[PDB]
A paper describes a structure:
In P. aeruginosa, two soluble lectins, LecA and LecB were initially identified and characterized. Both lectins are calcium‐dependent tetrameric proteins with one binding site per monomer. On the monosaccharide level, LecA is specific towards d‐galactose (Gal), while LecB binds l‐fucose (Fuc) with the highest affinity but can also recognize other monosaccharides such as d‐mannose. Besides their proposed primary function as adhesins, lectins also participate in biofilm formation and exhibit cytotoxic effects.
Additionally, we successfully co‐crystallized the LecA‐14 and LecB‐14 complexes to characterize the structural interactions between bispecific α,β‐thiodisaccharides and lectins. The structure of the LecB‐14 complex was resolved at 1.85 Å in the P212121 space group, with 8 protomers in the ASU. Examination of the Fo−Fc electron density map facilitated the unambiguous placement of 8 copies of compound 14 in the model, one for each of the 8 monomers in the ASU. The α‐l‐fucose moiety interacted with calcium ions via O2, O3, and O4, while the C6 methyl group was stabilized with Thr45 via hydrophobic contact. The β‐d‐galactose is situated within a binding groove, anchored by a water bridge connecting its O4 and O5 oxygens to Asp96, and engaged in interaction with the C6 carbon and a hydrophobic patch formed by Val69 and Gly24. The structural alignment of compound 14 structures bound to LecA and LecB, respectively, via l‐fucose, unveiled a tilt of the d‐galactose induced by the interaction between compound 14 and the binding groove of LecB. In the case of LecA, KD of all ligands was in the submillimolar range, whereas, for LecB, KD of bispecific inhibitors reached the submicromolar range. Due to the lack of an extensive linker in compound 14, both lectins have insufficient space to simultaneously bind a single molecule of compound 14. This finding supports the earlier discussion on the inability of bispecific inhibitors to bind LecA and LecB simultaneously.
Residue numbers in the entry:
A (entry chain B), B (entry chain A), C (entry chain C), D (entry chain D): 1 to 114
The structure:
């Protein structure tokens, strides 16, 4: 099944944050309506934040997270969770190797903001 | 129902990151085994990371998130989500006022790390 | 925080299924746009399905689950989870006593159907 | 990533319920410790509950959901969510064709019971 794709409400501000837990450098791309809206790159084995940004979901609401290490696409796992019918999290895990911890890059998208 | 309390696997490192979306200064307290392990404070209406730390769940695995604004306990909502039977997120939202956006402080706990 | 309230897409069919795990008879009311759309009652300590129905979300898409036992409203816990940006689950547990298993009635809403 | 596989606490009762939303006959198999513990089959475009059962997770606690149509394995999606640190749902969707609604068989596992 496709993973790392989420339909947000249109024209909404949202936060995107990425963490790294790998000896490899993680590159995280966030596409909005199929155009790169944020790119984070960094390396950590201690859950360091490698980037955070505020974005707007635009007219489509379509947000996609992609992860690669040295040009190789990581395998993704994802889900969206809504608390009290208001607070939204779109969560992404990624695996760059063999151990299947799926934490190599971790991406959290939250809305609403403000 | 109790919110913002999670049983993690014992003796496990976990990430805890807090975001602010409110006029009010948010104070996030993270307890492990009922003892304060981290305190974040900050103010933003643009989802600024007001703190991020790596902690250990210790022998109990009992982790609790509290949020207060100027001393007043915020109302919490929470859940845990597990992807591919491996990647864990504990999520907390909090409301300091009347608008019920539940984003005033947002706390994300993730494990495993490394 | 309010629990047991979910905003579905408007004019969309959804499944609702209730399960009981208590010595007391459980009454589950499902409201659509603030009007009773279905009512289920049953007693089980073995997770028996005490009711199932297909309903329409109507123009608001607002769906509310209420649970009571012998007249007394149960304490509710809820969340919505979306998998592969497509498959929606609205989940409710409820507590009628002191043991805090929150399974005394369990209500599962799923969409889309067909 | 592996989908439809869940680690439960050992020797615990859980409910499993399957729903169908397809013109094809769905076969849902539930494995405990890699052995078939329940089987449900049926065809519905209206969210019929094609089966519900109470099982015991056994000594491993490993539970797996498999779905097929006419012997062809369906693509699965899954997650686990925990409410008030107590109430557990393991959720599975499955796709038998090309439209990617992932609702063709839906399976929900809940614990604890009683
Ligand atoms: C620490 C370790 O990092 C990787 S495994 C690691 O990946 C790099 C990528 O550049 C090299 O291929 C090494 O040969 C590999 O050992 C993570 O997948 C793993 O979970 C762990 O965090
Ligand atoms: C921007 C706004 O912030 C608060 S409402 C705000 O709360 C502060 C708390 O110190 C004072 O009560 C102000 O008088 C209030 O208006 C959030 O609850 C709200 O969601 C929004 O982010
Ligand atoms: C078996 C038991 O059922 C209840 S406790 C039970 O509640 C009924 C009403 O539902 C009466 O108040 C009795 O006096 C109580 O003992 C559940 O709360 C519990 O989890 C367990 O399933
Ligand atoms: C109603 C429809 O059913 C299938 S698509 C459907 O699958 C059967 C399987 O036996 C045949 O291949 C038909 O030729 C196909 O049209 C679902 O995938 C779809 O979501 C929808 O529920
Ligand atoms: Ca890895
Ligand atoms: Ca890793
Ligand atoms: Ca607020
Ligand atoms: Ca706010
Ligand atoms: Ca109870
Ligand atoms: Ca009970
Ligand atoms: Ca389908
Ligand atoms: Ca279908």
């Amino acid at each position: 099944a496709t993973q790392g794709v989420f339909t947000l409400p249109a024209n909404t501000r949202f936060g995107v944050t990425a963490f790294a837990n790998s000896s490899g450098t993680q590159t995280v791309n966030v596409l909005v309506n199929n155009e790169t809206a944020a790119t984070f790159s960094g390396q950590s084995t201690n859950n360091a934040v490698i980037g955070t940004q505020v974005l707007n979901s635009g007219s489509s609401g379509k947000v996609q997270v992609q992860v690669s290490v040295n040009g190789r696409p990581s395998d993704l796992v994802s889900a969206q969770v809504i608390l009290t019918n208001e607070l939204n999290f779109a969560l992404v895990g990624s695996e760059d190797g063999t151990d299947n911890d799926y934490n190599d890059a971790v991406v959290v998208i939250n809305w609403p903001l403000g």
